[PDB]
Design a protein around this ligand. Sequence first.
Ligand SMILES: [Ca+2]
Ligand SMILES: [Mg+2]
Ligand SMILES: [Mg+2]
Length: 430
Amino acid sequence: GPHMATGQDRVVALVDMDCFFVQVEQRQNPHLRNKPCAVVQYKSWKGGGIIAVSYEARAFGVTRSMWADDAKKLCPDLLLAQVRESRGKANLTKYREASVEVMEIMSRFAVIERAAIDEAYVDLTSAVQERLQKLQGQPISADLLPSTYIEGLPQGPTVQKEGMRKQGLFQWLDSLQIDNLTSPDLQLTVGAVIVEEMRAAIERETGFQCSAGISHNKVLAKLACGLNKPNRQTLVSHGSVPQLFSQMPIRKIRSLGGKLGASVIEILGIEYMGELTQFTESQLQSHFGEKNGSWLYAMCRGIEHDPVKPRQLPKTIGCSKNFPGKTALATREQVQWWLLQLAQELEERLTKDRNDNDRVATQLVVSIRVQGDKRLSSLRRCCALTRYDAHKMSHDAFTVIKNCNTSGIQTEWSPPLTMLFLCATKFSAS
DNA sequence: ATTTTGACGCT
Ligand SMILES: [Ca+2]
Ligand SMILES: [Mg+2]
Ligand SMILES: [Mg+2]
């Protein structure tokens, strides 16, 4: 009752660039705009692996992870842009730099947590308070929310998508109590106004469109963001949670898409997030551990406390390459040459990072996979990263991994290596 | 033969 927390203390948004690598390539090459197109890495093996797909091409069934040759079977007019290749490997610099463009714009509005190359959480609580004080009891016009969906509306006593969107927004705004500045629904609504402004600024200043979710925590904001894509934003209120979760597969909630969510489904014999409400906190802790159990107990009620962390920059800078099938590295010279390629890309990115961001990495992590091992990484070792020098870093990585070679032959490497991975970590201010 | 990333939890 009067003491039960409701998780309505913050306004949190999640902003997600639509088909991001595709938009970067479409901005650069106008011939690709408004066409079925995809971004592909490499080209020799089956036309290359697709890593991003425009919504026009998704309509044909083209997906990420698909080989371009197969996608062309679904979509014969599919246009393709290739990721740059440098030093023998795919090089993602263009997309990292485009990401910085967008994150710097978002940071003008509020504190952001970089969640991936194309998405960030936004803590809007303070910005909403200030905007509410500026408004001075003035109602919020639908014109301030031209791309916003209110999840769960319209309801109760038009057959077009935009007409439905507007009907629901009208019902929401008609019900709103705009004179209580502490009202969580009003706070979410002002948050959505700010996110419309943020998304307009991103599009004006970069050309890139994005979607967004606005709710009271990160998990609900992330879920909301996916409800109406592309180029739209969705407000998920606390009150919408019971209906939304009542048919929501557990795997759709962030962190439950893998083994833990599978165990929740199997052990409890349920399918939907809302079904979790029927268990006590102790029951859930008994099955899934103290932390996970408490988290699930709160989350199925719409409540999550994970903070938006103030972190706009990645914590690690890494470079990796797979060597599948017959290309697995089987000689020492091969291993050393590719460690050098990876180390040279790493040195370039690290020097740029030091100049831009006033920090230096202090640890070098070396990871390899051996042929036959099902795990993505077979071995991980660390060593000191004391100089931004590619020859030193590659020599050090070889030193820490050279004892993995079973081969009694000096020149040969066995078992063959199917993956090399160098990662700079443990940054310190510089 | 997806590939190339990135963050965080466990012990
Ligand atoms: Ca995206
Ligand atoms: Mg995606
Ligand atoms: Mg994303």
